[PDB]
Amino acid sequence: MTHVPVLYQEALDLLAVRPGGVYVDATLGGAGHARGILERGGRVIGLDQDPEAVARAKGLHLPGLTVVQGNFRHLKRHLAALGVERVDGILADLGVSSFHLDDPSRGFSYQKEGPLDMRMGLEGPTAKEVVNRLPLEALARLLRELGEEPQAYRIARAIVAAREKAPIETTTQLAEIVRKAVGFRRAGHPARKTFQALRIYVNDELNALKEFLEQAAEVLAPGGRLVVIAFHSLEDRVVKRFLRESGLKVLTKKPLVPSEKEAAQNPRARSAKLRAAEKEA
Numbered sequence: 001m002t003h004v005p006v007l008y009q010e011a012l013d014l015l016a017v018r019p020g021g022v023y024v025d026a027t028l029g030g031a032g033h034a035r036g037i038l039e040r041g042g043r044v045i046g047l048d049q050d051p052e053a054v055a056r057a058k059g060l061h062l063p064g065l066t067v068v069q070g071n072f073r074h075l076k077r078h079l080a081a082l083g084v085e086r087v088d089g090i091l092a093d094l095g096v097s098s099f100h101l102d103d104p105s106r107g108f109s110y111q112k113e114g115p116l117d118m119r120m121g122l123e124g125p126t127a128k129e130v131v132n133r134l135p136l137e138a139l140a141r142l143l144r145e146l147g148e149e150p151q152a153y154r155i156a157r158a159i160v161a162a163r164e165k166a167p168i169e170t171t172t173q174l175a176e177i178v179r180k181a182v183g184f185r186r187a188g189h190p191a192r193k194t195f196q197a198l199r200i201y202v203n204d205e206l207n208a209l210k211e212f213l214e215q216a217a218e219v220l221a222p223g224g225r226l227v228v229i230a231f232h233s234l235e236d237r238v239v240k241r242f243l244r245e246s247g248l249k250v251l252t253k254k255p256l257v258p259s260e261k262e263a264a265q266n267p268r269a270r271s272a273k274l275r276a277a278e279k280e281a
């Protein structure tokens with residue numbers, strides 16, 4: 001009915017906020033976690049590429065919060081433009097915003113009709129252009145690599161068959177095309193993996209993440225904490241590998257996961273994996 005930010009206390013405790021400190025909330029969203037950092041006395045530089053989240057966040061007029069519209073893969077550059085080279089802590093709660101999920105017009109849901117857009121921000125071609133133009137081979141690779149889709153070729157072929165008939169324009173048309181090609185699927189609706197892959201591709205999520213992570217490690221002041229909450233297999237693996245290969249002190253050998261109570265209350269929270277590391281010296 002409101003939804004407490006995922007792993008709120010765990011994330012904040014790991015950030016070890018101290019009054020006067022400066023923290024980066026790299027995925028501001030509705031500012032749920034940011035509010036917690038402000039409450040603990042830290043200042044927050046919050047980034048978000050979704051124009052609707054940026055507008056909303058600013059409309060909250062929270063003292064101590066600086067909102068930056070932009071992609072976290074430009075973190076170092078944007079902090080430098082605010083006159084900041086080091087920060088005390090960094091948080092990233094990955095995924096789409098409330099608007100992305102509750103506003104069918106953004107085209108993120110295979111269940112709610114809307115145009116195939118899927119861009120969290122305003123950068124690059126839409127999912128519509130990707131599904132109507134990528135050659136079969138490229139399409140299948142995208143589904144396989146970014147969606148871990150076992151029936152990548154079969155789905156890609158169905159998408160090509162349909163688009164050669166008429167442009168694929170809506171989430172529900174794409175979802176039905178994938179559903180007809182796959183049929184029953186135990187794990188989740190047959191269109192889920194395809195939608196996830198297209199979302200990752202359209203937003204170049206994995207590379208943006210890898211770039212943000214290395215810049216985050218660099219700008220952390222001594223003893224500062226990098227805290228990331230991952231929600232799907234591919235991004236959690238990127239976070240896990242980065243942290244262990246980074247040289248940072250890994251604080252969470254195993255990811256922190258929400259209690260069944262939190263999982264019960266907030267479904268989105270069920271696949272959450274929180275990992276953190278510390279900058280030393």
Ligand SMILES: C[S@@+](CC[C@H](N)C(=O)[O-])C[C@H]1O[C@@H](n2cnc3c(N)ncnc32)[C@H](O)[C@@H]1O
Nearest residue numbers: 005027029030031032033048049050071072097
């Ligand atoms: C799960 S929501 C954040 C919810 C937030 N923790 C709260 O408590 O309200 C993630 C936000 O990250 C943003 N986001 C995702 N990838 C991004 C990127 N590469 N650069 C900037 N913002 C990004 C989205 O637009 C979305 O608003």
